[PDB]
Amino acid sequence: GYVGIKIRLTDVAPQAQELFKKESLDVKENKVYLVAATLRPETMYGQTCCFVSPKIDYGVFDAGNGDYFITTERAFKNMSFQNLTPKRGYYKPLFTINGKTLIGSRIDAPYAVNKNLRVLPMETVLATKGTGVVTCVPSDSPDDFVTTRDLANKPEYYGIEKDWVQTDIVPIVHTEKYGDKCAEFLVNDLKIQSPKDSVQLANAKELAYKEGFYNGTMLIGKYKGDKVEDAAPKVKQDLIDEGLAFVYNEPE
């Protein structure tokens, strides 16, 4: 399974405003969330944006009790089978929305120390994995770092504005092998120049995880100074207790 991170949609992008208005779904009154799937809840302090795929047609689903989730239909269907939605096996969204239509939207990500976060495009989101929504932690995720780099280097070309992408990375996890921004270290060390270098990125991802999780120390938050291995389950439970996240499993 995954930890679903409830990223609050505070302001919708101009191209999506006419869509949300037609549905009578005010993001100021109602709680509309992009639900990002993560296995690294301890890294939520370093969220710099939320990624959606331009290729994916997301659903806006009734999550019950005034909540609304933006995910793939596959993911929401899975959530319905484990008491996270109003009705078991019901997964028709209120409406469908392409990832491109959400780009530029403003969001509030749980535990993120950086402010003024935006929804940005990620071309390499695997549509059949998790929720199809990926939160961006460039300090420790090689995929997120390489995607952020390309967006920051040619923002207008990528259909975004300069101020929407954040490059001033706040360190979250200290490591002995790769310093305090292991993803930056590893992307440079392995000379990964494109987000589509899947084989090398998978290598970097695993190296970053093993060192950061098993040997890393938290640099921020309630568990600053603690080993990541000890802190991670505590951060996860805190997020769940505070209504900012939840766990959900998949078939098989």
Ligand X SMILES: Nc1ncnc2c1ncn2[C@@H]1O[C@H](COP(=O)(O)O)[C@H]2O[B@-]3(OCc4cc(F)ccc43)O[C@H]21
Binding site for ligand X (CB under 6 A): 37-40, 43, 125-126, 129-130, 132, 134-135, 137, 140-141
Residue 117 near residue 163, CB atoms below 8 Å: no
Closer residue to ligand X (CB): 93 or 132:
132
Least Cβ distance, residue 56 to ligand X (angstroms): 9
How many other C-beta atoms can be found within 10 angstroms of the C-beta atom of residue 64? 12
> Smallest distance, Å, CB 153 to ligand X?
21
Structure tokens at 57: 């047609």
Q: Nearer Cβ to ligand X, position 13 or 173?
A: 173
Can you name the residues that pair with 98 across neighbouring β-strands?
A: 57
Judging by beta carbons within 10 Å of its beta carbon (0-12, 13-18, 19+), is residue 54 exposed, middle or buried? middle
- Which residue lies nearer to ligand X by CB, 9 or 56? 56
Q: What gap in Å lies between CA 204 and CA 177, rounded to an integer?
A: 13
Paired strand residues for 227: 217
Residue nearest to ligand X (CB): 140
Nearer to ligand X, 27 or 239 (CB): 239
Cβ proximity to ligand X: between 126 and 162 the closer is: 126
Burial class (CB in 10 A: 0-12, 13-18, 19+), 73: middle
Minimum separation from the CB atom of position 63 to ligand X (A): 19
How far apart are alpha carbons 10 and 18 in whole angstroms? Answer: 16
Nearest distance in Å: CB 179, ligand X: 14
* Shortest separation between residue 17's beta carbon and ligand X, angstroms: 27
Q: Minimum CB separation from ligand X for residue 49, in Å? A: 12
Any alpha helices (H) in the chain, and if so which ranges? 14-22, 73-80, 99-102, 142-153, 182-189, 198-209, 215, 228-241
What angle (nearest 5°) sits at the alpha carbon of residue 99, between those of residues 193 and 151?
30
Closest to ligand X by CB, 9 or 137: 137
